[model samples]
Target: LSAASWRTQSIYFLLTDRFGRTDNSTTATCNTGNEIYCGGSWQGIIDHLDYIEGMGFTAIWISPITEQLPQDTADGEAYHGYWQQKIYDVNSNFGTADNLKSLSDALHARGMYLMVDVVPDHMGYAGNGNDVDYSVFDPFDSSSYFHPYCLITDWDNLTMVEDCWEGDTIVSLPDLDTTETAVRTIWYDWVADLVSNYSVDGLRIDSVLEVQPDFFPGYNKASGVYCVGEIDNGNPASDCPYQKVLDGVLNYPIYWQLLYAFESSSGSISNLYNMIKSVASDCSDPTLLGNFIENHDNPRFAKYTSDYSQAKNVLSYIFLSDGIPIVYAGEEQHYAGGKVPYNREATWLSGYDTSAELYTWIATTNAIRKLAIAADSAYITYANDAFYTDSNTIAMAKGTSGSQVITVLSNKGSSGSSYTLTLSGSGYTSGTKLIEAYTCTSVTVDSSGDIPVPMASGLPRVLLPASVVDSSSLCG
Candidate 1:
């Protein structure tokens, strides 16, 4: 679905365990001591639904809700939802199935979409012996499903991709042999039910590139939901050896480009251009990719840039450029965590800082997006090299027909210098007042249809329609 159709949703992505505490916490026997479940619960999410909706996010991507491995893995905990133990069951640590439904209901009542994370590639590996407490699993029987145990030694082979250890961990989650007809049937059957029962609007498939390539179309067809795969490769120009495996990737390629553009002077601008240009030709649907500056898996963009200016620069790039822009929970408030639980901290810690500068900026930008070219799914973009210039700055224009949005991002640490950007679209005009996205400020177009912006350090400059005016007025 087009992003604009949703009233400009800001996706508040979170990990269930770190979000809140639930009354009926997952079964205590399900390993509460594991760091993954720390203190977050399904009830926690329900209790804090207002906090999320109040922040202007119309959607939330919670960590996977399925039954997870009972114990902590070699990496610390399965709290992040990577260790999938069963698809038919809910992780008792998070909450009961009814709690999940309540969370979904609360989100829907606030007119928010619920995007559930799903893991289809492998099941929990509680050591070689599979020491999971079988009572929490589905069918109430141990041998009703699953394949034999085998560590995946070959990363590049399809067999290893479909059936092998997902990560180096204390538990060896024997990959589900999806190639087996029975396994595929059971997997899809369970997922279909989960989607239907939970009212989930989208799916964030973890480690999608690791699953058998042919399996996804069927999976997507069965679930009937919008999906984005986490293919953790960098840069669109850099070979995404597994690019063809899924519908839309996580936009890691452009993310790397954005990082370089804002942080390094080493051909970062060129890398950004090359990355988008390459993806235009290579990806199945480049625009559908999930454009993000930061998520749970990486250090916050604010931390890496060491300043909000650089982070805002990255945000401007992703929101205006392409794909669905995703915001991890604390990004707007500039939460500075660099690891899992830290990055996954509850929104309550910041007291849901709604009036924060970053929060205002996000709301304004999203409003502009909903009202601009981003709202049009069929919109097309033609990047002109002339408009893209300046040190520690990246700019682009995207639209179709005559309407468009011109965006400029600067991470110049401190700002004094200004850049004159030559803007052009199908219907060009001068003397137009382009509404500044963040503060409702306006900049007038020059005789040459160019707008010069002087931005403060760490702030983004975006130009959109203040009011519709004839494109031919300037030439007269």
Candidate 2:
């Protein structure tokens, strides 16, 4: 899919090895800290398309499908799909080459897009961080293809972050020198075939900051699809610069801001609001970036609090904000996992329960977002999310006057006292009627062109003009 079309899609991001089981078995035992494959397969994902689509996601972003370092390293195996051993072959552990193709075909047949995650920054070695023999690797099977095995001591140093090895003493990710003509040439050719043969609509490029900035424009062109890379930095100025080189980057700076705002009751709405303003100012087109509340690498949003209201606020921000939305697997279940293996829980363990609280919450939100886009072609195109700000809340509005979705997020936890306030920037004329999408209740605008808002239990409010929401069967 083109970058423009991709912006209209809300993605369901799943780790291939932890998302589903080939047998469709719900009884399989999975220990997250074991550092081993959990039998999740491409066929397994094909078996669960309804689980994803029902949430209103138009696209699925799966983990890397390349052959990985088979032997277990000192730390773990390549279950997360990051460790790469063979560049051309599909990971047999996930499924056969044909099964991988079938997964793509299934998604396409359902009128959905497939975004495969790829890693070109490094090659995996199962041994200690150092002392690697490159002979066993594929076409780039030589020491010349990689930089010297130097440990990265400084994260702020561009040279160290880009050129030095990533893994520590136990597990080594041999850094690839993309600055070398031979290395980049091989990468461009390999990626072209990878995208063409698999019918890949887009790519979630891993560890972009670790690679040379000059390497992406050519590689993105060669892949011939939208490529959104990952920049782990929290600084907008440093992270947003990657937008000049790639199609887009994951909204890491915003993710950090959201974490600070929603992780606890004491979090700040002003901080989150300023963050949205800063990111819009820095990035050329912030709408192209993928917005998320939780992902594989980071702790779950629920890790800090059991309050569903806080979680709902975070989900609203992810789905209704200026950028494309991404929901990682198990997030709908409110999985309270923290870091590395813990964050990578098996989705099957939850039984793919569609009626789960957050699952249904997402379905309604997606329905509203889909309806918003259907009514206003500019819904997905609008990058500047104007909002009415308060000490504890930010009421954000996106799209034109005909069909705008205004989401009000509060930092108050579930036990916070109920409150009411007048919401401005809603764009409704005096005496205009609005529908709160979540409750499907009627709201009227006063003579001041503002609407009264009543929030209870710290839950969020999603509003739209009554005429705009004419019968999509939501909240009926």
Candidate 3:
């Protein structure tokens, strides 16, 4: 798939070592600690492609596959594949290189894409004589390829953030000097080869902000695939700059604002409304951005709120909003681990429950999104034009013409009473028939082109034009 259609994709993110364990003979055990290999492999993912595809996800983003340092650290083991030892070699812990190729082939055969995570910012720590010799790392064998060892003391300083090491003592991973011409050349060739050899469809650039912004264009150009960077900052001012250089960025700003509105009692829906407007106006192409509620790096959305309806509302928002939607592995099961390794739980614990409420909701919403985009390709380009919001309710219109989708969300719990609300500018003419796609409920536009929204606490109502409803076979 080209970058042109990247907006249409729904991505599922999984840790290579925590998703599943295919080799029963391996001694890896999960949940024992925050930092050990759990024996997940490419074969494991390959065997379970149906589990992800059944949820209507069109793409899968796996963790890094490059050879990692074999030693364990005081912090943890290098099981996550973030600690790279060699760029050219595949980690035997995950599987052989051919196994990765087969996974890619399997996804493509099913009309799905494979997006691999990559770490260009740093390499694994050289432990107390327990690490691979630095000279063995492909073209980055010498000390000249990396920045001088310096701990990142000042995150506010861009130079220090770019030049300093990411960790110290327990895991003193050396930062790469991306600005150096030789270093840039090596990375360019390395990425080009990796993508071609593995038949990768996209890349999730890890710790993207740790390197110079200029390095991304060349790196992405080398890979020749849709690329998204992990700009971990929540402030749009800090995160938006990289979007100008890279194809897109992980939508962190929106994630934080969503948490504020949906998770906190004092939080206002107007804040989320304003943030959506700001992102559409600020981003280079907001459609290309990856929209997600939870990922490997953070606590699950369930951790913030146990109310299943509230969680469903949040998931609905991501599905109908602009940009590509990404669901972290265990999120569908409402996994509530609070921090790092705990948050990256094994999916097997849930037994890949397709009957779970969140899982079913995701499948339904993804189906709607796919139908909406299919009916009009311009749906991907359409921005949410929010027309109403207050302390607890938000109403917005997505897409245009007769294919528009209007949605209303409420943070109020089930105890909240239903009320009549008026919504306008939804691209519906007066007396036009509208169908609530999820519940098969029907309503007609008023004489003034206003929609009479009947509010239900914590349950989002998504409506489509009757024409779209009939064509999509929705609510039949």
Candidate 4:
């Protein structure tokens, strides 16, 4: 699939080793702190497609499927899927190659896309770095294909960041020699074959900045699909350049700003708005990037603060933003795991609860997005959100002309009270009727082309034109 096709997808990101188990056991104890496998499999995901689709996701971004280090490290195991050893074969820990293909086939039957994670920059080894047996690796079965052992000390230095190792002494992630012509050619051919063989619709490239920027254009094109890279830098200037080489990247610049602003009631809304402006100017097309609030690599929103309003506001903002929204597994269940192992929780532990508050709210958001898309083809293409920021609240209208999804949000916590707000360019005329998505209540716009916030209790309001709301089952 192309980048244009990915724009309409709201992805449900899950750790393949932690999302579900082949047995479908809710009683299984997954001590995430242990950093060991919990017996999740590709069959696990195929069995739980309803749980993901019920929440309104159109795509699924899975963990890496390649073979990884079999040995355990001092910190933990390679359950996170970043540690890759063999590039040509599927990790039997996840299931056989056919099991993965079945998952892809299942997703496609429902018109959903499948995005597999890939690690091309390194090979994981748990033994002494000096004594690593490269012969165990599939194609890179020699020391000549890797860089010399040296941990990256200076993150800002391009040379060290690209060439140096990411893991420490206990678990060495040998960096690939991407500069060599033979290395790149091998990589290109492998990716093309991998995508074709697996029926992968897209890709999530791990640690993209660890490789030289020049290494991706060929690699990305060879894959022949939408590839979104992981550029974990918090500054817009640092992450924006990657958009030029790859199809897209995770929205790291705005992600930090969101974490800072929406984590607490006292957070800054204007600062978050400023960061959005910076990304708008810096990025080639900010709308094409993957917008997310939580991921396996970061702490959960609940960990920041379990304020229900704060969590809802963050989710609402991400879904309503211009980019493709991504919600990591366990977020809907309000899992508060912080950092690596803790962040990667077992989704089945929640028993796949479809009635969770956040889960239903996400479905509502997607319903509204689908309604907008149905009315305006440009909703996911040309139309951008028109933002209006307040000291404590912000309102935005996104779509072309009249078929916009008008949303209002605030930094107020769960105990916040009612307030009225007006929109400046909400794409509606005087006396136009608008329906609040959750309640299905209709409100008439004032003479100045604005609607009064009739009721609130520190919650989000996603509105659509009353006439267009009929086609959606949002509040029905």
Query: Candidate 3, clashing residue pairs?
Result: none
Residue range 93-136, candidate 2, lDDT tens digits: 89999998899899899999999999989988877556787876
Q: What is the C-alpha RMSD of each candidate to the true structure, in Å?
A: 5.3, 1.3, 2.2, 1.4
Off by over 4 Å in 4: none
* Steric collisions counted per model: 9, 0, 0, 0
Return the lDDT, model 2, position 333: 90
Instruction: List per-prediction Cα lDDT, in the order shown.
Output: 0.65, 0.87, 0.84, 0.85
TM-score of each: 0.84, 0.97, 0.96, 0.97
Can you write out model 3's per-residue Cα lDDT over 126-152, one digit (the tens) per residue? 552234257856657888788887888
Error of 2 at 363 (Å): 0.5
Candidate 2 all-Cα RMSD: 1.3
How far in Å is the alpha carbon of 10 misplaced in model 1?
3.8
Q: Report clash pairs, candidate 1.
A: 17-40, 26-92, 26-93, 36-79, 74-170, 125-172, 125-173, 235-253, 309-458
Measured with C-alpha atoms, the lDDT of residue 49 in candidate 1 is 76
Q: Write down the lDDT that model 1 would get.
A: 0.65
Residue 333, candidate 3: C-alpha displacement in angstroms: 0.4
Count clashing pairs, candidate 3: 0
* Higher-scoring candidate on TM-score, 1 or 4: 4
Model 4 residue 224 lDDT? 96
For candidate 3, the per-residue lDDT at 386 reads 79
